[PDB]
Symmetry: C2
Subunit: 182 residues, 2 copies
Protein backbone atom coordinates (compact mmCIF):
# COMPACT_ATOMS: atom_id res chain seq x y z
CA UNK A 1 0.00 0.00 0.00
CA UNK A 2 2.76 2.41 0.95
CA UNK A 3 4.83 1.93 -2.21
CA UNK A 4 1.66 2.22 -4.29
CA UNK A 5 0.72 5.60 -2.81
CA UNK A 6 4.32 6.81 -2.39
CA UNK A 7 5.12 6.54 -6.13
CA UNK A 8 1.73 8.00 -7.07
CA UNK A 9 2.25 11.01 -4.80
CA UNK A 10 5.72 11.62 -6.28
CA UNK A 11 4.27 11.46 -9.79
CA UNK A 12 1.57 14.00 -8.94
CA UNK A 13 4.12 16.31 -7.43
CA UNK A 14 6.27 15.99 -10.56
CA UNK A 15 3.44 17.24 -12.74
CA UNK A 16 1.96 19.87 -10.47
CA UNK A 17 -1.24 17.99 -9.68
CA UNK A 18 -2.85 18.69 -6.26
CA UNK A 19 -3.06 15.75 -3.86
CA UNK A 20 -6.39 15.15 -2.10
CA UNK A 21 -6.36 12.29 0.40
CA UNK A 22 -9.30 10.76 2.23
CA UNK A 23 -7.88 9.35 5.43
CA UNK A 24 -9.34 6.39 7.29
CA UNK A 25 -6.59 4.21 8.73
CA UNK A 26 -6.49 2.42 12.04
CA UNK A 27 -2.77 1.84 11.70
CA UNK A 28 -0.38 -0.60 10.06
CA UNK A 29 -1.19 -4.21 9.14
CA UNK A 30 0.15 -6.38 11.99
CA UNK A 31 2.42 -9.25 11.05
CA UNK A 32 5.96 -10.57 11.17
CA UNK A 33 6.17 -10.68 7.38
CA UNK A 34 5.59 -6.96 7.14
CA UNK A 35 8.56 -6.48 9.47
CA UNK A 36 10.70 -9.16 7.82
CA UNK A 37 10.00 -7.75 4.36
CA UNK A 38 10.86 -4.28 5.64
CA UNK A 39 7.72 -2.37 6.57
CA UNK A 40 9.71 0.27 8.36
CA UNK A 41 11.95 0.95 5.37
CA UNK A 42 9.34 0.45 2.61
CA UNK A 43 6.59 2.16 4.57
CA UNK A 44 8.71 5.29 5.06
CA UNK A 45 8.53 5.94 1.31
CA UNK A 46 5.03 7.35 1.75
CA UNK A 47 6.24 9.84 4.38
CA UNK A 48 9.13 10.96 2.21
CA UNK A 49 7.02 11.41 -0.92
CA UNK A 50 4.36 13.39 0.95
CA UNK A 51 6.74 15.59 2.94
CA UNK A 52 8.70 16.32 -0.22
CA UNK A 53 5.59 17.27 -2.21
CA UNK A 54 5.15 20.99 -2.94
CA UNK A 55 1.87 20.93 -4.84
CA UNK A 56 -1.36 21.89 -3.07
CA UNK A 57 -2.27 19.32 -0.37
CA UNK A 58 -5.72 18.86 1.13
CA UNK A 59 -6.45 16.03 3.58
CA UNK A 60 -9.91 14.89 4.69
CA UNK A 61 -10.19 12.48 7.64
CA UNK A 62 -13.54 10.75 7.35
CA UNK A 63 -12.98 8.33 10.19
CA UNK A 64 -9.91 6.59 11.66
CA UNK A 65 -6.47 8.18 12.01
CA UNK A 66 -4.34 6.52 14.71
CA UNK A 67 -0.65 6.70 15.66
CA UNK A 68 1.92 6.93 12.90
CA UNK A 69 -0.87 6.14 10.44
CA UNK A 70 -2.18 9.66 11.13
CA UNK A 71 1.32 11.01 10.54
CA UNK A 72 1.70 9.51 7.09
CA UNK A 73 -1.84 10.15 5.89
CA UNK A 74 -1.67 13.91 5.24
CA UNK A 75 -0.66 15.05 8.68
CA UNK A 76 -0.83 18.86 9.07
CA UNK A 77 2.71 18.83 10.45
CA UNK A 78 3.90 16.77 7.49
CA UNK A 79 3.21 19.74 5.23
CA UNK A 80 -0.50 19.41 4.47
CA UNK A 81 -2.02 22.76 3.56
CA UNK A 82 -5.64 22.38 4.52
CA UNK A 83 -6.90 19.69 6.86
CA UNK A 84 -10.58 18.79 7.23
CA UNK A 85 -12.25 16.35 9.59
CA UNK A 86 -15.77 14.90 9.68
CA UNK A 87 -17.79 14.57 12.87
CA UNK A 88 -16.92 10.86 12.81
CA UNK A 89 -13.20 11.50 12.82
CA UNK A 90 -11.21 9.65 15.46
CA UNK A 91 -7.73 11.17 15.72
CA UNK A 92 -5.76 9.58 18.58
CA UNK A 93 -2.46 7.96 19.57
CA UNK A 94 -4.15 4.55 19.52
CA UNK A 95 -7.46 2.75 19.97
CA UNK A 96 -9.22 3.20 23.30
CA UNK A 97 -9.12 -0.59 23.74
CA UNK A 98 -5.35 -0.70 23.97
CA UNK A 99 -5.14 2.87 25.22
CA UNK A 100 -6.76 2.18 28.60
CA UNK A 101 -4.16 -0.51 29.16
CA UNK A 102 -1.38 2.07 29.46
CA UNK A 103 -3.20 5.22 30.63
CA UNK A 104 -5.11 3.41 33.36
CA UNK A 105 -2.26 1.16 34.51
CA UNK A 106 -2.68 2.02 38.18
CA UNK A 107 -6.47 2.05 38.40
CA UNK A 108 -6.31 -1.41 36.81
CA UNK A 109 -3.84 -2.53 39.47
CA UNK A 110 -6.33 -2.41 42.35
CA UNK A 111 -8.77 -4.02 39.91
CA UNK A 112 -6.99 -7.26 40.78
CA UNK A 113 -7.22 -6.57 44.53
CA UNK A 114 -10.31 -4.72 45.76
CA UNK A 115 -13.27 -4.63 43.37
CA UNK A 116 -12.13 -7.33 40.96
CA UNK A 117 -13.79 -7.88 37.59
CA UNK A 118 -11.61 -6.58 34.77
CA UNK A 119 -14.20 -6.06 32.00
CA UNK A 120 -16.45 -3.63 33.85
CA UNK A 121 -13.84 -0.98 34.59
CA UNK A 122 -11.57 -1.97 31.77
CA UNK A 123 -14.62 -1.69 29.54
CA UNK A 124 -16.14 1.39 31.11
CA UNK A 125 -12.90 3.37 30.96
CA UNK A 126 -12.53 2.32 27.35
CA UNK A 127 -15.87 3.87 26.47
CA UNK A 128 -15.03 6.85 28.67
CA UNK A 129 -11.68 7.41 26.99
CA UNK A 130 -13.43 6.88 23.67
CA UNK A 131 -16.15 9.42 24.43
CA UNK A 132 -13.80 12.12 25.69
CA UNK A 133 -10.68 11.86 23.50
CA UNK A 134 -11.29 9.70 20.44
CA UNK A 135 -12.72 12.48 18.25
CA UNK A 136 -11.62 15.33 15.94
CA UNK A 137 -11.89 18.13 18.50
CA UNK A 138 -8.68 17.40 20.43
CA UNK A 139 -6.74 17.82 17.19
CA UNK A 140 -8.93 20.71 16.02
CA UNK A 141 -7.88 22.55 19.17
CA UNK A 142 -4.18 21.93 18.49
CA UNK A 143 -4.67 23.33 15.01
CA UNK A 144 -3.74 19.97 13.42
CA UNK A 145 -7.22 20.23 11.91
CA UNK A 146 -8.24 23.46 10.18
CA UNK A 147 -11.96 22.84 10.67
CA UNK A 148 -14.44 20.09 11.49
CA UNK A 149 -17.08 20.28 8.77
CA UNK A 150 -20.13 18.24 7.90
CA UNK A 151 -19.44 15.53 5.27
CA UNK A 152 -21.65 17.29 2.67
CA UNK A 153 -19.39 20.36 2.74
CA UNK A 154 -16.29 18.40 1.65
CA UNK A 155 -16.95 18.97 -2.09
CA UNK A 156 -17.29 22.74 -1.80
CA UNK A 157 -14.34 22.99 0.55
CA UNK A 158 -11.88 21.18 -1.71
CA UNK A 159 -13.14 23.32 -4.54
CA UNK A 160 -12.40 26.60 -2.78
CA UNK A 161 -9.23 25.28 -1.16
CA UNK A 162 -7.81 24.30 -4.56
CA UNK A 163 -8.40 27.87 -5.78
CA UNK A 164 -6.76 29.50 -2.74
CA UNK A 165 -3.71 27.22 -3.04
CA UNK A 166 -3.62 27.70 -6.81
CA UNK A 167 -0.47 29.85 -7.01
CA UNK A 168 1.11 28.09 -4.03
CA UNK A 169 4.80 28.95 -4.11
CA UNK A 170 6.90 26.25 -2.43
CA UNK A 171 10.20 24.45 -2.93
CA UNK A 172 12.75 22.15 -1.24
CA UNK A 173 16.26 23.27 -0.11
CA UNK A 174 19.09 23.28 -2.71
CA UNK A 175 20.35 19.75 -3.47
CA UNK A 176 21.08 17.43 -6.41
CA UNK A 177 18.42 15.08 -5.03
CA UNK A 178 17.15 13.55 -1.81
CA UNK A 179 17.89 10.11 -0.45
CA UNK A 180 14.47 8.44 -0.33
CA UNK A 181 14.52 4.87 1.09
CA UNK A 182 14.77 2.48 -1.84
CA UNK B 1 21.32 -6.67 -3.94
CA UNK B 2 19.92 -4.14 -6.39
CA UNK B 3 18.14 -2.12 -3.77
CA UNK B 4 21.17 -2.38 -1.49
CA UNK B 5 23.40 -0.80 -4.16
CA UNK B 6 20.84 1.65 -5.55
CA UNK B 7 20.42 3.49 -2.23
CA UNK B 8 24.17 3.38 -1.57
CA UNK B 9 24.90 4.88 -4.99
CA UNK B 10 22.42 7.68 -4.39
CA UNK B 11 24.01 8.33 -1.00
CA UNK B 12 27.53 8.62 -2.47
CA UNK B 13 26.25 11.08 -5.07
CA UNK B 14 24.43 13.15 -2.42
CA UNK B 15 27.70 13.69 -0.60
CA UNK B 16 30.10 13.81 -3.52
CA UNK B 17 31.74 10.39 -3.07
CA UNK B 18 33.22 8.90 -6.28
CA UNK B 19 31.61 5.57 -7.25
CA UNK B 20 34.04 2.75 -8.08
CA UNK B 21 32.42 -0.38 -9.52
CA UNK B 22 33.96 -3.84 -9.68
CA UNK B 23 32.00 -5.74 -12.31
CA UNK B 24 31.55 -9.51 -12.50
CA UNK B 25 27.86 -10.35 -12.89
CA UNK B 26 26.71 -13.20 -15.12
CA UNK B 27 23.19 -11.82 -15.09
CA UNK B 28 20.16 -11.82 -12.81
CA UNK B 29 19.17 -14.59 -10.41
CA UNK B 30 16.37 -16.70 -12.08
CA UNK B 31 13.28 -17.67 -10.16
CA UNK B 32 9.54 -17.06 -10.09
CA UNK B 33 9.85 -15.33 -6.73
CA UNK B 34 12.23 -12.75 -8.11
CA UNK B 35 9.54 -11.93 -10.65
CA UNK B 36 6.44 -12.02 -8.43
CA UNK B 37 8.22 -9.91 -5.82
CA UNK B 38 8.94 -7.32 -8.49
CA UNK B 39 12.49 -7.72 -9.76
CA UNK B 40 11.83 -5.60 -12.83
CA UNK B 41 10.49 -2.73 -10.72
CA UNK B 42 13.01 -3.04 -7.88
CA UNK B 43 15.90 -3.85 -10.15
CA UNK B 44 15.43 -0.56 -12.01
CA UNK B 45 16.43 1.33 -8.85
CA UNK B 46 20.11 0.42 -9.35
CA UNK B 47 19.81 1.66 -12.91
CA UNK B 48 18.07 4.85 -11.84
CA UNK B 49 20.58 5.61 -9.09
CA UNK B 50 23.62 5.23 -11.30
CA UNK B 51 22.16 6.99 -14.34
CA UNK B 52 21.27 9.86 -12.01
CA UNK B 53 24.67 10.17 -10.29
CA UNK B 54 26.98 13.01 -11.37
CA UNK B 55 30.02 12.21 -9.20
CA UNK B 56 33.16 10.77 -10.80
CA UNK B 57 32.36 7.20 -11.88
CA UNK B 58 34.97 4.54 -12.54
CA UNK B 59 34.10 0.99 -13.52
CA UNK B 60 36.42 -2.02 -13.72
CA UNK B 61 35.20 -5.31 -15.22
CA UNK B 62 37.29 -8.14 -13.80
CA UNK B 63 35.49 -10.97 -15.52
CA UNK B 64 31.87 -11.59 -16.52
CA UNK B 65 29.42 -8.91 -17.72
CA UNK B 66 26.40 -10.27 -19.61
CA UNK B 67 23.18 -8.76 -20.97
CA UNK B 68 21.31 -6.16 -18.94
CA UNK B 69 23.56 -6.81 -15.95
CA UNK B 70 26.40 -5.32 -18.02
CA UNK B 71 24.34 -2.16 -18.42
CA UNK B 72 23.24 -1.71 -14.86
CA UNK B 73 26.87 -2.14 -13.82
CA UNK B 74 28.33 1.33 -14.41
CA UNK B 75 28.30 0.78 -18.16
CA UNK B 76 29.94 3.35 -20.42
CA UNK B 77 26.69 4.43 -22.08
CA UNK B 78 25.12 4.54 -18.63
CA UNK B 79 27.11 7.65 -17.71
CA UNK B 80 30.35 6.04 -16.43
CA UNK B 81 33.37 8.31 -16.94
CA UNK B 82 36.22 5.80 -17.21
CA UNK B 83 35.64 2.13 -17.99
CA UNK B 84 38.45 -0.36 -17.46
CA UNK B 85 38.60 -4.12 -18.26
CA UNK B 86 40.80 -7.07 -17.29
CA UNK B 87 42.07 -9.52 -19.94
CA UNK B 88 39.72 -12.06 -18.34
CA UNK B 89 36.67 -9.90 -19.03
CA UNK B 90 33.77 -11.55 -20.81
CA UNK B 91 31.51 -8.80 -22.10
CA UNK B 92 28.67 -10.08 -24.25
CA UNK B 93 24.92 -10.30 -24.64
CA UNK B 94 24.91 -13.67 -22.92
CA UNK B 95 26.96 -16.73 -22.13
CA UNK B 96 28.40 -18.59 -25.12
CA UNK B 97 26.45 -21.55 -23.77
CA UNK B 98 22.96 -20.38 -24.73
CA UNK B 99 24.27 -18.09 -27.45
CA UNK B 100 24.99 -20.85 -29.94
CA UNK B 101 21.36 -21.91 -29.66
CA UNK B 102 20.29 -18.64 -31.27
CA UNK B 103 23.24 -17.61 -33.41
CA UNK B 104 24.00 -20.98 -35.03
CA UNK B 105 20.28 -21.78 -35.11
CA UNK B 106 20.00 -23.33 -38.56
CA UNK B 107 23.45 -24.86 -38.42
CA UNK B 108 22.18 -26.76 -35.37
CA UNK B 109 18.92 -27.56 -37.14
CA UNK B 110 20.86 -29.56 -39.73
CA UNK B 111 22.65 -31.27 -36.84
CA UNK B 112 19.52 -33.25 -36.08
CA UNK B 113 18.47 -33.92 -39.67
CA UNK B 114 21.48 -34.17 -41.98
CA UNK B 115 24.91 -34.44 -40.39
CA UNK B 116 23.94 -35.21 -36.82
CA UNK B 117 26.28 -35.05 -33.83
CA UNK B 118 25.13 -32.05 -31.82
CA UNK B 119 26.55 -31.91 -28.31
CA UNK B 120 29.85 -32.45 -30.03
CA UNK B 121 28.88 -29.70 -32.50
CA UNK B 122 27.19 -27.50 -29.93
CA UNK B 123 30.46 -27.67 -27.96
CA UNK B 124 32.70 -26.77 -30.89
CA UNK B 125 30.54 -23.81 -31.79
CA UNK B 126 30.33 -22.81 -28.14
CA UNK B 127 34.11 -22.72 -28.10
CA UNK B 128 34.52 -20.81 -31.40
CA UNK B 129 32.02 -18.14 -30.36
CA UNK B 130 33.64 -17.95 -26.93
CA UNK B 131 37.15 -17.61 -28.36
CA UNK B 132 36.11 -14.88 -30.81
CA UNK B 133 33.29 -12.79 -29.31
CA UNK B 134 33.27 -13.32 -25.55
CA UNK B 135 36.16 -11.05 -24.62
CA UNK B 136 36.99 -7.45 -23.69
CA UNK B 137 38.16 -6.34 -27.13
CA UNK B 138 34.81 -6.27 -28.92
CA UNK B 139 33.60 -3.72 -26.34
CA UNK B 140 36.96 -1.91 -26.31
CA UNK B 141 36.80 -1.48 -30.09
CA UNK B 142 33.33 0.03 -29.75
CA UNK B 143 34.71 2.40 -27.12
CA UNK B 144 32.49 1.10 -24.31
CA UNK B 145 35.79 0.45 -22.55
CA UNK B 146 38.43 3.17 -22.23
CA UNK B 147 41.24 0.61 -22.13
CA UNK B 148 42.06 -3.03 -21.41
CA UNK B 149 44.81 -3.15 -18.80
CA UNK B 150 46.52 -5.65 -16.48
CA UNK B 151 44.83 -6.30 -13.13
CA UNK B 152 47.95 -5.07 -11.35
CA UNK B 153 47.62 -1.68 -13.07
CA UNK B 154 44.10 -1.21 -11.63
CA UNK B 155 45.00 0.61 -8.38
CA UNK B 156 47.19 3.17 -10.12
CA UNK B 157 44.65 3.71 -12.86
CA UNK B 158 41.86 4.51 -10.43
CA UNK B 159 44.20 6.94 -8.71
CA UNK B 160 44.93 9.05 -11.80
CA UNK B 161 41.26 8.77 -12.83
CA UNK B 162 40.03 10.18 -9.53
CA UNK B 163 42.47 13.05 -10.01
CA UNK B 164 41.33 13.78 -13.54
CA UNK B 165 37.65 13.74 -12.53
CA UNK B 166 38.49 15.66 -9.37
CA UNK B 167 36.51 18.77 -10.27
CA UNK B 168 34.15 17.09 -12.73
CA UNK B 169 31.21 19.13 -14.05
CA UNK B 170 27.80 17.47 -14.27
CA UNK B 171 24.42 19.18 -14.59
CA UNK B 172 21.18 17.20 -14.16
CA UNK B 173 17.97 18.31 -15.98
CA UNK B 174 15.98 21.03 -14.16
CA UNK B 175 13.19 19.39 -12.15
CA UNK B 176 11.80 19.43 -8.63
CA UNK B 177 12.79 15.78 -8.48
CA UNK B 178 12.83 12.58 -10.49
CA UNK B 179 10.40 9.70 -10.26
CA UNK B 180 12.54 6.71 -9.37
CA UNK B 181 10.55 3.47 -8.97
CA UNK B 182 9.66 2.74 -5.36
Amino acid sequence: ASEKAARFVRTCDCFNIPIVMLVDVPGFLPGTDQEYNGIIRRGAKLLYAYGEATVPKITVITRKAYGGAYCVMGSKDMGCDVNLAWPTAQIAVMGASGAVGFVYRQQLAEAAANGEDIDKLRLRLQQEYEDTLVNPYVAAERGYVDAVIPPSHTRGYIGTALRLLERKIAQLPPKKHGNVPL
